[PDB]
Write a protein that holds these residues in place. Sequence first.
Motif, short mmCIF file in Angstrom:
data_model
loop_
_atom_site.label_atom_id
_atom_site.label_comp_id
_atom_site.label_asym_id
_atom_site.label_seq_id
_atom_site.Cartn_x
_atom_site.Cartn_y
_atom_site.Cartn_z
N UNK B 117 0.82 -1.20 0.00
CA UNK B 117 0.00 0.00 0.00
C UNK B 117 0.85 1.25 0.00
N UNK B 118 0.28 2.29 -0.58
CA UNK B 118 1.01 3.45 -1.07
C UNK B 118 1.04 4.48 0.06
N UNK B 119 2.15 4.46 0.80
CA UNK B 119 2.50 5.52 1.71
C UNK B 119 4.00 5.46 1.96
N UNK B 120 4.62 6.61 2.21
CA UNK B 120 6.08 6.66 2.23
C UNK B 120 6.65 5.98 3.46
N UNK B 121 7.75 5.25 3.26
CA UNK B 121 8.43 4.57 4.35
C UNK B 121 9.93 4.77 4.31
#
Lengths: 207, 147, 203, 102
Positions: B117-121
Amino acid sequence: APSRNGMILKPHFHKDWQRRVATWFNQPARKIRRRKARQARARRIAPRPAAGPIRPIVRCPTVRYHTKVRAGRGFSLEELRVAGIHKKVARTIGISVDPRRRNKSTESLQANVQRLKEYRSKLVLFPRKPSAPKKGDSSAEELKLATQLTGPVMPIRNVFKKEKARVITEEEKNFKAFASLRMARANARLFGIRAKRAKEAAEQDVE
Amino acid sequence: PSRLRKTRKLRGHVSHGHGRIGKHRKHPGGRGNAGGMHHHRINFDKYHPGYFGKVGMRHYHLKRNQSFCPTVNLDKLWTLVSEQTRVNAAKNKTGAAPIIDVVRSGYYKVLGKGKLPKQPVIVKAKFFSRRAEEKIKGVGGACVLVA
Amino acid sequence: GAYKYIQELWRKKQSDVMRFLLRVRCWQYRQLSALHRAPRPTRPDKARRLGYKAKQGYVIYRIRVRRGGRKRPVPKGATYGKPVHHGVNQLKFARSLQSVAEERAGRHCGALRVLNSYWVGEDSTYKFFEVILIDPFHKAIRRNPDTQWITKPVHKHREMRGLTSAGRKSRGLGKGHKFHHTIGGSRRAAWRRRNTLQLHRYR
Amino acid sequence: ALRYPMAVGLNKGHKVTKNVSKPRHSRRRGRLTKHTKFVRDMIREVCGFAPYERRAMELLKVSKDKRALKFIKKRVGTHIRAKRKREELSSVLAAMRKAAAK
RNA sequence: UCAGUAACGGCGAGUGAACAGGGAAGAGCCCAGCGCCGAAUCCCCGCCCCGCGGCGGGGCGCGGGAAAUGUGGCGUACGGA
RNA sequence: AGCGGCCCCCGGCGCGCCGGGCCCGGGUCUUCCCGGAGUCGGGUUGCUUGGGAAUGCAGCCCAAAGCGGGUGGUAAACUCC
Ligand SMILES: [Mg+2]
Ligand SMILES: [Mg+2]
Ligand SMILES: [Mg+2]
Ligand SMILES: [Mg+2]
Ligand SMILES: [Mg+2]
Ligand SMILES: [Mg+2]
Ligand SMILES: [Mg+2]
Ligand SMILES: [Mg+2]
Ligand SMILES: [Mg+2]
Ligand SMILES: [Mg+2]
Ligand SMILES: [Mg+2]
Ligand SMILES: [Mg+2]
Ligand SMILES: [Mg+2]
Ligand SMILES: [Mg+2]
Ligand SMILES: [Mg+2]
Ligand SMILES: [Mg+2]
Ligand SMILES: [Mg+2]
Ligand SMILES: [Mg+2]
């Protein structure tokens, strides 16, 4: 005489094993023996700590375990020369000393000297003769409040720092990690040949 | 449970469930795994292929700690950090990023298997893999090494 | 003073001096018997490095031991059995000749307790030694506070149970990867800990 | 670009500073003393040399050193002990050559 | 616990360890040598006093014996004088 | 059954004296001293161990050394830690 489909296996019973068989029916009558020889030991020394003198903080080897901190044997002699304690008094006040330890780092030397400075401020020291102290003894106040400490003294606990959520730089998008791990593998395998062919060219260029 | 067995139901039959022509004698076919190459050949050639022979290099004082390397996928990389950090991270408009530690949770290497899933890490680890690095570079976020 | 370099004289064994003093002492010793008492040790250097204080109580013998292996005491050949166990000539003994000499001079004088042994000379067919014996009950040994550990009844016959330095080599023990198979007490209990089934209660 | 302490490569490992402490005394065993050389050479001055070296001196007078190396390696042990023995007998050979040249 | 594993073996049948990690228990030390203090050392016999069913302490012995081929004290690799 | 009673005996350990014994410790700086020898190791033959160009032990001949020696699981030299 194996049948259709079962696993092959080799049992180790061709020896005579019925002669040397160690039963364990002792066990619930030896946990009571150790419980009595530990509580009658805990009442011989009435105000002393029951769990042995304090024991140093040491990492662990073998890259599987090198991220823990566990108990040790005893303090070194740099952790006592800096902390200003003579090496045969510390045996008599409950401080474990082993002379076989190095200190190649510094950041565990300091955290041991700090732990000693905690224990020296927690320690209640009784007078020899209960009529006359020394310069460094304790007052007649704390004697009435002196009691035991069940459990390992100042238990050693693994702590972790934390970090909050930063904002990602424009730079770290352009950092290729895998072609650097496989560059350091190639550079770590070709250190001799690269430094030898240059020598052979320095033997060849005199012409 | 002696009463549920078979031999308690065979008291009366003469042979006790092992025949009369060829009786239950002691050891007909050798003791154990006798005859791997002579007369029990078909069972090992049909059920244990490659029982026989040598292959490869020997390695004498082998430890199981220099080659210790547990793994993980990108599917459950969010299971280490509790739920309310992934929420606050998907909720804030600022552009911050929650730091995920694997070495602390008992993992070293980061492989890549699934959808993410698309969120910055930001990932701190000791190794990576090429797919599992281009999925985070493709979502947005980095891949940070540590010794 | 002298004891530092009598020490360094007694490792010129190839030189002409010690090749004279042995080409004499081995002859003198050869016309004597097999086990006799000398009044003072030939080497005081090596004698003091083992515990020989020069007071009342300590005794020094001197015994010879013949040399070679050990061939098996059977009739003519006739070692009945498989052809592995035929060997009679070239067998070799496990303990050294030095702890043969210690327990030959430890059984004949049973009232004493052995301390240690050392070397003196060699012939073609003879190896000589020296031994050090201690009175257990004499008042000089008794009232010393350091070394009244002998008189305790545990240390009877140190040499038959293998506790001298000459038997400590035969046992095969130390530390390291080189000495795996004597973990525990000895070689036997390093076998006993292994070849048993610990059958727990619940399993 | 950026650099990280890489756990594989040429200079791997976590970066921790280091202290300089006094080396342990046991780290010196019998290195040497002046009193020792004083007496070990006096005993060398009393007794001479062994008869496996009263042939090596006589094969090192003809400037053969490979042959007297295979002759002191066959007897005494390895090639290292053969070297530190030979460099010593080119000295207690050259001190006679020095005193006879004097 | 690692482990019926790395390995051995007509590489067939079969034999077969340890290190690390968590625990019970936790206690550490002395001599020789190098040197300094006038044998600064013991054991036994003698007389007396006390106590003596585990034979000991203090006083006296021109009373005798062993030890300079080394008896005692300080001192042992964590450095020491 | 009960921290119920009584009568004996031997101790463990606490306090008073009366006796003798032993006068000793730190820190900071200058000058001195410092280690176990037919053993280590090497060749070989034989038993052994999971230990495999030989883990240990034992026997025969050879036989050492001080910025030295052994170990760093494939024999061998040159090297660094
Ligand atoms: Mg069948
Ligand atoms: Mg029927
Ligand atoms: Mg049937
Ligand atoms: Mg029948
Ligand atoms: Mg039939
Ligand atoms: Mg059957
Ligand atoms: Mg056979
Ligand atoms: Mg031993
Ligand atoms: Mg398993
Ligand atoms: Mg076959
Ligand atoms: Mg362990
Ligand atoms: Mg405990
Ligand atoms: Mg002393
Ligand atoms: Mg002394
Ligand atoms: Mg065998
Ligand atoms: Mg031997
Ligand atoms: Mg190797
Ligand atoms: Mg190397």
